Amino acid sequence: SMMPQWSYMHISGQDASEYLSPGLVQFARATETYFSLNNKFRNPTVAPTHDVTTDRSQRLTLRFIPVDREDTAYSYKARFTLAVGDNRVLDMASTYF
């Protein structure tokens, strides 16, 4: 009636340093080492919705067929085209054979 339900139940809103009265934040920091008031109050963690993850068709993991294989009696050679498309970044730690 006076607050939305995510901000009443503290699902998306202010941390406990912001919605609690300033005497209680001052009290909870002073008595923290012998009477903890920390787990009594719900802090929201909000994931970002903008400029983080695309909303387009984009494959997480690609699978690259070798462009040119080359077998030898002692070695084996595979040639790939590791193509990173438009507006994409690829950390080479995620790549493997």
Binding site: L20, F35, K40, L60
Partner: protein, 150 residues
């Protein structure tokens, strides 16, 4: 059947008080009676249980939600159980519960995780989830494969 019985003699309720100073505990009392200093809590699992039955030698489990606002939905978490090893809870006494081993519904002793082949999640009866060609097989969550050629 095996003759085990338990008798409960008495209960006491023990409550340890911190011996706080009486004008420190009166300040903390009147701060915490303010409607902005309400102690808000949270269930750790934070989930709604749904136990769906799987018959003997049954493979597909089609489940269906009719219509709901899906706001503040966090995700799924699924594990196969056994009907012998899960009591009909909600009722105060299950007279047909002839089992006294570990109850994986209650203690987290899950062990049928390997018995899952695939998962297909579709929103609004038409749109596959996650969609957007995210996965190597984008329409479903293939958990394991018996036949792998690719």
């Amino acid at each position: 059947v095996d003759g085990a019985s338990i008798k409960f003699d008495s209960i006491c309720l023990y409550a340890t008080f911190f011996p706080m100073a009486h004008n420190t505990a009166s300040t903390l009392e009147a701060m915490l009676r303010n409607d902005t200093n309400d102690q808000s809590f949270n269930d750790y699992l934070s989930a709604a249980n749904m136990l769906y039955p799987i018959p003997a030698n049954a493979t597909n489990v089609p489940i269906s939600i009719p219509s709901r606002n899906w706001a503040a939905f966090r995700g799924w978490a699924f594990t196969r159980l056994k009907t012998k090893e899960t009591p009909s809870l909600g009722s105060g006494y299950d007279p047909y519960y002839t089992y006294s081993g570990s109850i994986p519904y209650l203690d987290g002793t899950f062990y049928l995780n390997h018995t899952f082949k695939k998962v297909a999640i579709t929103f609004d009866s038409s749109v596959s989830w996650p969609g957007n060609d995210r996965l190597l097989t984008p329409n479903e969550f293939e958990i394991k494969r018996s036949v792998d050629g690719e």
